[PDB]
């Protein structure tokens, strides 16, 4: 789905499989967080579903030793003195020692501040212990976590329940037309994107000799050259858009290991799964009720949350018993209007735009010489038109699908293209869609605060700040204290501070709250990028202070207070909303749960070979399942005729479904339901 999606996939730790355990064989002990997981396996990253506990991710700093156990880096403490020497410990090795938590205060030389410190001990037990007994200490505070988990700002503020979702959901994000790095980060964004291998890194140092949209050429110091070929508009495994754009201009001096071109969801070599939007924490005329989301039409007009998706369609021409399927522009009983977008071969032309129902690859097959209808024989005598022996077996555009035809791949047995036994011509037509964000598209934050798009109001209907700036997204206040994921609230505050900029008051010295604040942060520009590393980073103190340092706008007016709130005007009525509204910038990802995919419906369709019931799946154009639980619902209602109709003429009554179709197009009454072909199979199966 995205570079992170791939990265986390590789670091998955799965108990399932041959030599492992079944999902039904797993008890509740396998699946809960074991203490030895620390710094080795993530306790946050794991599936929500029935696979929970059995699939995890490897912690960031953990490595594998030749015997297949999981080691983790610990700093060594000689005698209360922290050493920069590091030794990897296996799980049982760590049990025999005594380890100090990472964030325990340490002298400028290396010594501990307090005698008794927080200590992790064997069997998950913890107890204060004098510093003379401290063997090792954690390398980093963010050591128990995985790479995904480590990208959730203010993690220590979210409940593990939604922090878990927030983790799982980042890998569900979709690559947008172009990507913005988040105003608020944790530092992981960089290392992730690079190690993800879906960006372009420079092998050896040198200078950009030539730059194109197609490739980047580098002139090394030793004279040799390496040219990097950009992956452009490629279909992923999940149909997302892996598009790589060069970063460096021509003649730039670049050093080895530097990102010279980023890819999907990546800005300047940093993980960019979403955009930085203008958030307003408030209920709004019910359109954000129960985790529903309201969006500004700006995001549609400005292609902010717009993405590209590619489908790969396929068809082949085999040897049959009546001849061999031939691909041709000549299709039985079809106007030259429907074929107006094909070439001479029978293939769609590149650049053409396709709707569902249209033709992509014109294929015909010789039909079995069976005696045509005595009623169709007479109909061919009147009009004197001889029937063809070739049934249209074309490749048409599936329901829902639509876009521009951005490529054709053709494989001919004739052109010695080694096909499998029986195939002659094989065509693949690639169609891309530029999907604007619509109603029902699933947005999410890094805090498990998911939800679908309820409404997209005109840009003027949106609640706006004093200077006229209309907000982008309106999140519901109610779905916030419930979820315990107030780290989304902290992200909002730090977000706005990062938007406007700030400057602490240095006159009368450096303020006491900003006394722990690293010098570099006492002054910040409008739209400045920051890092709040997990189990580190900004504190609620610094944040509150920073809210007062908020620099004024271009009109010279501060827009939000020290509470983090700001006054809003209803874009509809015009009157100002009575109370101050929490406003800031929150990072929103576009998830792969779009309505264009998820929507489906079926009148009549294909049917089950054995049970004569409708098939299942949007790909098979199947119907819904009206199951055992759903039957009881009808039964409780006492709607017997509905219920009957559902499991009869609407399902597997061979003669009924056909005769109900005729009753509808004729405008007559619905007939009486026959016998369910499934039941006839039962009696024969019992027989």
């Amino acid at each position: 789905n995205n570079p992170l999606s791939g990265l986390t996939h590789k670091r998955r730790l799965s108990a399932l499989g041959p030599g492992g355990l079944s999902r039904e064989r797993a008890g509740l002990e396998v699946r809960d967080v074991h203490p030895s997981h620390y710094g080795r396996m993530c306790p946050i990253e794991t599936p929500e579903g029935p696979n929970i506990g059995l699939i995890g991710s490897l912690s960031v700093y953990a490595r594998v030793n030749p015997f297949g156990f999981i080691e983790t880096p610990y700093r060594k403490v000689v005698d209360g003195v922290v050493s920069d020497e590091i030794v990897y410990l296996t799980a049982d090795e760590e049990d025999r020692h005594v380890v100090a938590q990472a964030n325990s205060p340490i002298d400028a030389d290396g010594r501990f501040v307090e005698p008794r410190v927080l200590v992790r001990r064997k069997a998950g037990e913890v107890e204060y212990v004098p510093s003379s007994e401290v063997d090792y200490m954690d390398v980093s505070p963010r050591q128990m976590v995985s790479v995904a988990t480590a990208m959730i700002p203010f993690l220590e503020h979210d409940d593990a329940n939604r922090a878990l979702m927030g983790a799982n959901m980042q890998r569900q994000a979709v690559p947008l037309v172009r990507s913005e790095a988040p105003l608020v980060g944790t530092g992981m964004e960089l290392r992730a994107a690079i190690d993800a291998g879906d960006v372009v890194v420079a092998e050896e140092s040198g200078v950009i000799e030539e730059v194109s949209a197609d490739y980047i050429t580098v002139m090394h110091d030793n004279g040799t050259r390496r040219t990097y070929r950009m992956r452009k508009f490629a279909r992923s495994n999940h149909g997302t858009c892996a598009n790589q754009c060069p970063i460096v201009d021509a003649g730039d001096r670049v050093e080895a290991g530097q990102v010279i071109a980023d890819g999907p969801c990546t800005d300047d070599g940093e993980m960019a799964l979403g955009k930085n939007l203008l958030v307003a924490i408030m209920p709004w005329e019910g359109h954000n009720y129960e985790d529903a989301i309201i969006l500004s039409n700006r995001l549609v007009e400005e292609d902010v949350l717009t993405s590209i998706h590619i489908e790969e369609h396929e068809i082949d021409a085999r040897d049959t018993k009546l001849g061999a399927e031939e691909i041709t522009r000549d299709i039985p009983n079809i106007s030259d209007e429907v074929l107006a977008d094909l070439d001479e071969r029978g293939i769609v032309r590149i650049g053409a735009e396709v709707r569902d129902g249209d033709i992509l690859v014109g294929k015909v097959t010789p039909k079995g010489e069976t005696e045509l209808t005595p009623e169709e024989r007479l109909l061919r005598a009147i009009f004197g038109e001889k029937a063809r022996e070739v049934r249209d077996t074309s490749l048409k555009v599936p329901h829902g699908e639509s876009g521009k035809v951005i490529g054709i791949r053709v494989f001919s047995r004739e052109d010695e293209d080694e096909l499998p036994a029986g195939v002659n011509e094989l065509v693949r037509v690639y169609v891309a869609q530029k999907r604007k964000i619509s109603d029902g598209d699933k947005l999410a934050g890094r805090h498990g605060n998911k939800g679908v798009i309820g409404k997209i109001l005109p840009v003027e209907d949106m609640p706006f700040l004093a200077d006229g700036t209309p907000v982008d997204i309106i999140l519901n206040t109610h779905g916030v204290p419930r979820r315990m994921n107030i780290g989304q609230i902290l992200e909002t505050h730090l977000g706005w501070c990062a938007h406007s900029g700030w400057k602490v008051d240095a006159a009368k010295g450096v303020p006491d709250w900003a006394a722990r604040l690293p010098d570099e942060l006492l002054e910040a520009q409008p739209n400045a990028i920051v890092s709040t590393p997990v189990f580190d980073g900004a504190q609620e103190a610094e944040l509150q202070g920073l809210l007062s340092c908020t620099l004024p706008n271009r009109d010279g007016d501060v827009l939000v207070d020290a509470d983090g709130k700001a006054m809003l005007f209803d874009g509809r009525s015009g009157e100002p909303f009575p109370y101050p509204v929490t406003v800031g910038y929150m990072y929103i990802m576009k998830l792969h749960h779009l309505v264009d995919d998820k929507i489906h419906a079926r009148s009549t369709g294909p049917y089950s070979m054995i049970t004569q019931q409708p098939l299942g799946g949007k790909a098979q154009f199947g119907g819904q399942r009206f199951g055992e639980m759903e039957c009881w619902a009808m039964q409780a209602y006492g709607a017997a005729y509905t219920l009957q109709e559902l499991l009869t003429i609407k399902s597997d009554d061979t003669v009924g479904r056909v005769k109900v179709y005729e009753a509808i197009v004729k405008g007559e009454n619905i007939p009486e339901p026959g016998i369910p072909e499934s039941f006839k199979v039962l009696l024969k199966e019992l027989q």
Binding site: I86, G257, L517, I529, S531, A538
Partner: peptide
Amino acid sequence: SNNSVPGAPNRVSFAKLREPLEV
């Protein structure tokens, strides 16, 4: 700065100094 190692944009970090080892 945070990761002054590859040639990245400067992302200023609230932190206690983390020098044990790079990821």
